[PDB]
Design a protein around this motif. Structure first.
Motif, mmCIF file in Angstrom:
data_model
loop_
_atom_site.group_PDB
_atom_site.id
_atom_site.type_symbol
_atom_site.label_atom_id
_atom_site.label_comp_id
_atom_site.label_asym_id
_atom_site.label_seq_id
_atom_site.Cartn_x
_atom_site.Cartn_y
_atom_site.Cartn_z
ATOM 1 N N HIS A 1 0.829 -1.191 0.000
ATOM 2 C CA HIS A 1 0.000 0.000 0.000
ATOM 3 C C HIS A 1 0.868 1.246 0.000
ATOM 4 C CE1 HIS A 1 -3.661 -2.305 0.687
ATOM 5 N NE2 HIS A 1 -3.003 -2.980 1.612
ATOM 6 N N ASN A 2 0.327 2.316 -0.570
ATOM 7 C CA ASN A 2 0.983 3.608 -0.477
ATOM 8 C C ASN A 2 0.865 4.137 0.946
ATOM 9 O OD1 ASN A 2 0.878 6.766 -0.662
ATOM 10 N ND2 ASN A 2 1.980 6.059 -2.486
ATOM 11 N N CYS A 3 1.911 4.828 1.401
ATOM 12 C CA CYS A 3 2.005 5.273 2.786
ATOM 13 C C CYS A 3 0.903 6.249 3.185
ATOM 14 C CB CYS A 3 3.382 5.898 3.006
ATOM 15 S SG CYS A 3 3.764 6.490 4.675
ATOM 16 N N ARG A 4 0.131 6.771 2.229
ATOM 17 C CA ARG A 4 -0.797 7.855 2.533
ATOM 18 C C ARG A 4 -2.007 7.418 3.357
ATOM 19 N NH1 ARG A 4 -2.138 6.473 -2.723
ATOM 20 N NH2 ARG A 4 -0.552 7.841 -3.661
ATOM 21 N N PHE A 5 -2.173 6.126 3.656
ATOM 22 C CA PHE A 5 -3.281 5.717 4.512
ATOM 23 C C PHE A 5 -3.134 6.252 5.929
ATOM 24 C CE2 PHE A 5 -0.081 2.417 4.835
ATOM 25 C CZ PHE A 5 0.017 2.232 6.197
ATOM 26 N N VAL B 1 12.486 7.687 6.573
ATOM 27 C CA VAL B 1 12.682 7.741 8.018
ATOM 28 C C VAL B 1 11.553 8.580 8.602
ATOM 29 C CG1 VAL B 1 14.132 8.599 9.881
ATOM 30 C CG2 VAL B 1 15.171 7.418 7.947
ATOM 31 N N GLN B 2 10.763 7.983 9.490
ATOM 32 C CA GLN B 2 9.678 8.672 10.180
ATOM 33 C C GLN B 2 10.014 8.813 11.657
ATOM 34 O OE1 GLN B 2 8.757 6.885 6.593
ATOM 35 N NE2 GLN B 2 8.915 5.670 8.469
ATOM 36 N N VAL B 3 9.887 10.032 12.180
ATOM 37 C CA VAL B 3 10.034 10.300 13.606
ATOM 38 C C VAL B 3 8.713 10.838 14.136
ATOM 39 C CG1 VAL B 3 11.556 11.224 15.365
ATOM 40 C CG2 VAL B 3 12.368 11.043 13.008
HETATM 41 C C1 LIG Z 1 4.673 8.035 4.884
HETATM 42 N N1 LIG Z 1 5.954 7.675 4.625
HETATM 43 C C2 LIG Z 1 6.403 7.550 3.325
HETATM 44 C C3 LIG Z 1 7.585 6.863 3.069
HETATM 45 C C4 LIG Z 1 8.079 6.764 1.774
HETATM 46 C C5 LIG Z 1 9.357 6.022 1.505
HETATM 47 C C6 LIG Z 1 7.378 7.356 0.734
HETATM 48 C C7 LIG Z 1 7.909 7.250 -0.664
HETATM 49 C C8 LIG Z 1 6.194 8.049 0.987
HETATM 50 C C9 LIG Z 1 5.700 8.148 2.286
HETATM 51 N N2 LIG Z 1 4.523 8.811 2.599
HETATM 52 C C10 LIG Z 1 3.656 9.540 1.609
HETATM 53 C C11 LIG Z 1 2.873 8.887 0.485
HETATM 54 O O1 LIG Z 1 3.485 7.706 0.024
HETATM 55 C C12 LIG Z 1 2.731 9.930 -0.632
HETATM 56 O O2 LIG Z 1 3.992 10.196 -1.194
HETATM 57 C C13 LIG Z 1 2.170 11.249 -0.103
HETATM 58 O O3 LIG Z 1 0.937 11.016 0.546
HETATM 59 C C14 LIG Z 1 1.976 12.314 -1.190
HETATM 60 O O4 LIG Z 1 1.494 11.804 -2.420
HETATM 61 P P1 LIG Z 1 -0.088 11.731 -2.704
HETATM 62 O O5 LIG Z 1 -0.418 10.516 -3.535
HETATM 63 O O6 LIG Z 1 -0.809 11.666 -1.378
HETATM 64 O O7 LIG Z 1 -0.515 12.975 -3.436
HETATM 65 C C15 LIG Z 1 4.133 8.889 3.927
HETATM 66 N N3 LIG Z 1 2.940 9.545 4.187
HETATM 67 C C16 LIG Z 1 2.468 9.612 5.480
HETATM 68 O O8 LIG Z 1 1.434 10.221 5.739
HETATM 69 N N4 LIG Z 1 3.197 9.019 6.486
HETATM 70 C C17 LIG Z 1 4.389 8.387 6.182
HETATM 71 O O9 LIG Z 1 4.983 7.822 7.092
#
Ligand SMILES: *[C@@]12=NC3=[C]C([C])=C([C])[C]=C3N([C][C]([O])[C]([O])[C]([O])[C]OP([O])([O])=O)C1=NC(=O)[N]C2=O
Length: 107
Positions: A37-41, A101-103
């Motif tokens: 999944h993309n991180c945006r969840f 890296v998330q803090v």
């Molecule tokens: C998320 N961490 C995170 C880690 C990596 C390696 C990457 C590439 C992205 C994230 N995101 C953001 C998400 O993947 C996306 O890039 C963004 O939401 C912006 O693009 P959209 O599609 O939304 O326009 C991370 N997002 C988080 O909210 N928390 C993280 O830890």
């Protein structure tokens, strides 16, 4: 204290493919709900769209980026995530993975 993930940039929407045990413990989510999944969840009502856009563009342009985001755990409670995304290139210059890296800087 920090957590670490790897996103697959060969796939079009940068799905997460690895996450440290701290990422699961911090966010409340399991690998069954994170991998693929993309991180945006992790985003929600109060997440700043101007900051979310900074990542969207840095990912498209294949740059490094660092943003402050409001994120929500599985149980709905918010926390402040200092997030730094680094692009990892192959020798031919193409981006293969994004590392994050998330803090939790709710302090
Ligand atoms: C998320 N961490 C995170 C880690 C990596 C390696 C990457 C590439 C992205 C994230 N995101 C953001 C998400 O993947 C996306 O890039 C963004 O939401 C912006 O693009 P959209 O599609 O939304 O326009 C991370 N997002 C988080 O909210 N928390 C993280 O830890």
């Amino acid at each position: 204290r920090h957590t670490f993930v790897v996103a697959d940039a060969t796939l079009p929407d940068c799905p997460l493919v690895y996450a440290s045990e701290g990422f699961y413990a911090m966010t409340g989510y399991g690998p069954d709900e994170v991998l693929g999944h993309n991180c945006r969840f992790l985003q929600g009502e109060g997440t700043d769209p101007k900051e979310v856009q900074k990542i969207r563009d840095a990912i498209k342009k294949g740059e490094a980026c660092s943003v402050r985001l409001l994120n929500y755990r599985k149980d709905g409670t918010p926390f402040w995530n200092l997030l730094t995304v680094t692009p990892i290139k192959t020798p031919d210059g193409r981006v293969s993975k994004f590392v994050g890296v998330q803090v939790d800087v709710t302090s």
